[PDB]
RNA sequence: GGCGAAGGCGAAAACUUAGGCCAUUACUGACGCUUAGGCUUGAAAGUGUGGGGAGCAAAUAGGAUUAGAUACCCUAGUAGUCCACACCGUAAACGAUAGAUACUAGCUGUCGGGGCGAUCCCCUCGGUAGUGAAGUUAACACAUUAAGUAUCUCGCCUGG
């Protein structure tokens, strides 16, 4: 379904990042992957594609912030803003 | 005490204050809560002193964690508010400023505009007398 | 005493699920189940204010038009007020057109006076249908104008069992510049009275004690004896 | 619809549901768009609801 | 008149509770509307889907009159 | 995540061969094991699904898997040895909670009160006895901690008052 | 009645999964907001592509009738309605009411969620509704889901 708790806790480095930028962007990226899988398995689900584009946009804005605030976001960039 | 109905960042303190003021005017409501700020505290104190607005209480949870102000309008014993119209001037999309020599008396020479300047916040008359100008926060009459 | 709190014992509750919210400002914080219960102290304060205010108004050579229009209870007891204190009484509300058009009350009172004169002056030539016409004209002009049926003076004040119950009463009230006071319920709009009296009327004791206190207020301004707030007994009579 | 063993009584209780089902089928025996069908059906439903409430 | 979540189990399959479903049923392929049994949205889902499911599995007349 | 799986198998087949068909059905079932051939009896179908007036009913109760029941469903459909292949999941609408599922004990009390076994009356579901005023009743209002009370006086109780002296 | 971004979602059954409702000082600490350009989707006719086509109706064609029927009647009846692909990407997609955001008498209904408890009643919040206060459209009326109140952004607008 949501694929929520496991991905959060994998991105949950400490007890001080339950809702941080890191876990949020990880959730959006994991949701992008899961939505691609689903919508390839379920073609005409336009809800999934519109949500995928919305998550892509919100991920872009989250990344622009994460590079505005912390300069170490792109030195270990496993979340490059290209999709 | 217990201050109920907190408000979060709507888009700005000024419009958050204006919507509450007009809703209180509409529903004949007494006391409403809005955000807290140094400018908001200054204008609220000066409006208590001016007579257009009744008192206010600024409240905090512990720190910048949550800072709000509850404010009441001065009402005669007829449910008639003392506020006969307040217009916000300082806005996000338009930062409005005026010199000390370009500040008018509102209503018919009675209304008092609230003006923050380079060295403080005050009323329109003493802003003209101060020879220092700046942004305007609210036209009150 | 004067507007004693002892009377303030059953002035609580009416038909629920129908109530003006702005009454909650003037009555009490009313629960989600529409608890029509009234406070005692504020109701007593407002009732005493209305009492002595109408007293001082009637001491100015004014008039307190006593209006009774509820099912039977308020009308019967307002008639008892009229037979106890010399004030006008209502059997049926006037259909409108009394104060702002003074001619419309004068024609009615003159018609009733001449109808009484005709009834007392000739009854042999009249037929059964003609007599029924005469009696029905008398009844019509007595109920089409209750406060003005034999007198032409303009009332200086009027009450009503409910200021939202009578459109014509409110019209001829707001035509004049007079301190209109009325028995107000929770389902009533409070914007049609001078001094709101938040109290019950479905409870018969409540309304009868209220308008009897009004009668005493107008009587003490007319230099005649007064009974309620001067006798500790509350009346027990079901709402006829 | 089937109401058995009675000539008139069970037939009388029959005819109600019989005509109900007959009309239910009848309004499905002609091509029409969803617009008018749903609008009229819900108009009748709201008529019955307001008569009931 | 609410019927499910008081006599039902809030989990309605065909077996173990088929009688509460058949109460809005007749061998005629119809379901009692809200005018007779005013069950809520989830209870209406229960009765609708489950009864047409019993019709679907050949337990009660699917369309048969 | 559990599967209540209901299989209606051919006509009036004998119990042994019906069980063998069912065993083949697990052999082509890729879901979780532990399901046993439970005979629900030979039930009369409302209509011939293909030509069988009455079919043998069977139930299986065990857990469930996500991408492991579509294939089982369509293979059981194609497998003509079984006529009907209904699935049920854990989630239909009901609760997964320790304060809404134990409310089914209140439902058992409702079953008890459904029939008046005594002269007294506790029937008629939705009869308000009003035993509860508690619950959450919480919108979580914000607690107020005093910072500064600029003129703590506040106007209140605006009575309908005008021209108090008319005498 | 709820949900879905509109388009829409109803014989049932399963799966992937968008998203939702309830309460969280709980975590980054404004990361925000929209939107010209830009990205994606987009009833449907009807286009061709492969099947079957059950049925029928654009067109077409006979008998009526008509001042005349390829209009209202029907029969025969294709494209199409069916599906797979694109394109058509328009709609009464209009609530002729933009998106994000916070606030405004109530009242009577419903659904969902949280608590509770024979049911239930009840409270909380939303969703889904209305009369109507206030407020607002010339007016018709909306009105806690505004056409009320206000901020950011955009699109539409000056005579036939």
From Swiss-Prot, chain B:
Pfam families referenced in this protein's UniProt entry, alphabetically: Ribosomal_S8 (PF00410)
GO cellular-component term (any): ribonucleoprotein complex
Keywords: Ribonucleoprotein, Ribosomal protein, RNA-binding, rRNA-binding
Biological process, per Gene Ontology: translation
PROSITE patterns: RIBOSOMAL_S8 (PS00053)
InterPro entries: Ribosomal_uS8, Ribosomal_uS8_CS, Ribosomal_uS8_sf
GO MF annotations, alphabetized: rRNA binding; structural constituent of ribosome
Family as reported in the entry's similarity comment: Belongs to the universal ribosomal protein uS8 family.
Function: One of the primary rRNA binding proteins, it binds directly to 16S rRNA central domain where it helps coordinate assembly of the platform of the 30S subunit.
UniProt xrefs under NCBIfam families: PRK00136.1 (NF001109)
Subunit structure: Part of the 30S ribosomal subunit. Contacts proteins S5 and S12.
Protein name listed in UniProt: Small ribosomal subunit protein uS8
Natural source organism: Mycoplasma pneumoniae (strain ATCC 29342 / M129 / Subtype 1)
Lineage start: Bacteria, Bacillati, Mycoplasmatota, Mycoplasmoidales, Mycoplasmoidaceae
Gene expressing this chain: rpsH
Swiss-Prot record, chain C:
Annotated GO CC locations: cytosolic small ribosomal subunit
Any one GO biological process: translation
UniProt entry keywords in alphabetical sequence: Ribonucleoprotein, Ribosomal protein
A GO MF label: structural constituent of ribosome
Family assignment from sequence similarity: Belongs to the universal ribosomal protein uS2 family.
Record's protein name: Small ribosomal subunit protein uS2
From Swiss-Prot, chain D:
Tagged with keyword Transferase: no
Alphabetical keyword list: Ribonucleoprotein, Ribosomal protein
GO biological process: translation
Oxidoreductase listed as a keyword: no
A cellular component term, taken from the record's GO annotations: ribosome
Gene Ontology terms, MF aspect: structural constituent of ribosome
Family according to the record: Belongs to the bacterial ribosomal protein bS21 family.
Protein name: Small ribosomal subunit protein bS21
Species, as recorded: Mycoplasma pneumoniae (strain ATCC 29342 / M129 / Subtype 1)
Gene (name only): rpsU
Swiss-Prot record, chain F:
GO MF annotation list: rRNA binding; structural constituent of ribosome
Basic and acidic residues compositional bias, start-end: 144-153
Keyword RNA-binding: yes
Positions of the UniProt region annotated as Disordered: 121-153
RNA-binding among keywords: yes
Signal peptide range in chain numbering: none
Keyword annotations from UniProtKB, A to Z: Ribonucleoprotein, Ribosomal protein, RNA-binding, rRNA-binding
Cellular component, GO annotation: ribonucleoprotein complex; ribosome
Coiled-coil annotated residue ranges, if any: none
Any GO BP: translation
Job description of the protein: Binds together with bS18 to 16S ribosomal RNA.
Family to which the UniProt record says this protein belongs: Belongs to the bacterial ribosomal protein bS6 family.
Protein name (Swiss-Prot/TrEMBL): Small ribosomal subunit protein bS6
Source organism of this protein record: Mycoplasma pneumoniae (strain ATCC 29342 / M129 / Subtype 1) (Mycoplasmoides pneumoniae)
Shown part of the complete sequence: 1 to 167 of 215
């Amino acid at each position: 379904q949501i694929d929520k708790n496991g991905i959060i806790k994998s991105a949950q480095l400490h007890d001080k990042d339950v809702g941080s930028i890191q876990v949020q962007v990880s959730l959006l990226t994991s949701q992008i992957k899961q939505l691609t899988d689903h919508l390839l398995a379920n073609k005409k689900d336009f809800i999934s594609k519109r949500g995928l584009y919305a998550k892509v946009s919100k991920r872009k804005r989250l990344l622009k912030y994460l590079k505005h605030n912390d300069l170490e976001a792109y030195r270990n960039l496993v979340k490059t803003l290209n999709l | 005490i217990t201050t109920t109905k907190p408000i979060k960042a709507h888009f700005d303190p000024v419009a958050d204050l204006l919507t509450k003021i007009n809703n209180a005017r509409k529903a004949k409501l007494m006391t409403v809560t809005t955000i807290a700020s140094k400018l908001k505290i200054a204008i609220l104190e000066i409006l208590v002193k001016e007579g257009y607005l009744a008192n206010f209480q600024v409240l905090e949870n512990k720190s910048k964690t949550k800072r709000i102000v509850t404010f009441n309008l001065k009402y005669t014993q007829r449910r008639i508010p003392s506020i006969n119209g307040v217009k916000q001037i300082s806005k996000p999309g338009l930062r409005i400023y005026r010199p000390f020599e370009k500040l008018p008396l509102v209503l018919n020479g009675l209304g008092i505009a609230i003006i923050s300047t380079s060295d403080g916040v005050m009323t329109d008359k003493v802003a003209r007398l101060k020879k220092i100008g700046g942004e305007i926060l609210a036209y009150v009459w | 005493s004067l507007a004693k709190l002892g009377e303030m014992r059953t002035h609580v509750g009416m038909v629920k699920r129908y109530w003006n919210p702005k009454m909650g400002f003037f009555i009490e914080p009313e629960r989600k189940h529409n608890n029509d219960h009234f406070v005692l102290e504020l109701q007593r304060q407002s009732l005493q204010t209305a009492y002595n205010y109408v007293k001082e108004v009637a001491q100015n050579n004014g008039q307190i038009l006593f209006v009774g229009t509820k099912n039977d209870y308020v009308k019967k007891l307002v008639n008892n007020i009229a037979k106890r204190v010399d004030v006008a009484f209502i059997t049926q509300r006037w259909l409108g057109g009394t104060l702002t058009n003074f001619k419309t009350l004068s024609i009615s009172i003159n018609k009733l006076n001449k109808l009484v004169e005709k009834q007392a002056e000739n009854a042999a030539d009249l037929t059964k249908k003609e007599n029924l016409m005469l009696s029905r004209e008398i009844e019509r002009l007595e109920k089409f104008f209750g406060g003005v049926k034999s007198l032409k003076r303009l009332p200086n004040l009027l009450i009503v069992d409910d200021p939202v119950y009578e459109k014509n009463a409110v019209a001829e009230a707001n035509i004049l510049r007079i301190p209109v006071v009325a028995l107000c319920n929770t389902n009533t709009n409070p914007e049609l009275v001078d001094f709101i009296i938040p109290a019950n009327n479905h409870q018969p004791q409540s309304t009868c004690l209220l308008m009897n206190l009004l009668a005493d207020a107008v009587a003490e301004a007319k230099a005649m004896p007064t009974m309620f707030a001067y006798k500790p007994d509350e009346e027990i009579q079901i709402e006829i | 619809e089937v109401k058995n063993d009675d000539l008139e009584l069970a037939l009388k209780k029959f005819k109600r549901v019989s005509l109900e089902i007959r009309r239910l089928a009848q309004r499905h025996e002609y091509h029409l768009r969803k617009g008018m069908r749903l609008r009229e059906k819900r108009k009748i439903a709201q008529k019955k609801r307001r008569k009931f409430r | 008149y609410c019927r499910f979540c008081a006599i039902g189990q809030l989990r309605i399959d065909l077996i173990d509770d088929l009688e509460a479903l058949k109460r809005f049923l007749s061998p005629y392929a119809k379901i009692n509307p809200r005018r007779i049994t005013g069950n809520c949205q989830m209870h209406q889902r229960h009765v609708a889907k489950a009864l047409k499911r019993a019709r679907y599995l050949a337990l009660v007349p699917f369309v048969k009159d | 995540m559990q599967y209540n799986i209901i299989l209606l198998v051919d006509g009036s087949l004998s119990l042994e061969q019906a069980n063998q068909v069912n065993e083949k059905q697990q052999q082509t079932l890729t879901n979780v094991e532990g399901l046993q051939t439970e005979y629900l009896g030979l039930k009369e179908l409302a209509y011939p699904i293909k030509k069988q007036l009455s079919a043998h009913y069977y139930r299986w109760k065990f857990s469930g898997d996500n991408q492991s029941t579509k294939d089982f469903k369509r293979t059981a459909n194609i497998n003509k040895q079984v006529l009907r292949e209904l699935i049920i999941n854990l989630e239909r609408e009901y609760g997964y909670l320790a304060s809404i599922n134990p409310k089914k004990q209140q439902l058992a009390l409702q079953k008890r009160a459904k029939y008046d076994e005594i002269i007294a009356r506790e029937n008629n579901p939705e009869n308000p006895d009003v035993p509860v005023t508690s619950g959450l009743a919480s919108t979580q209002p914000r607690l107020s901690r005093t910072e500064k009370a600029q003129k703590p006086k506040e106007e209140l109780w605006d009575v309908v008052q005008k021209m108090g002296n008319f005498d």
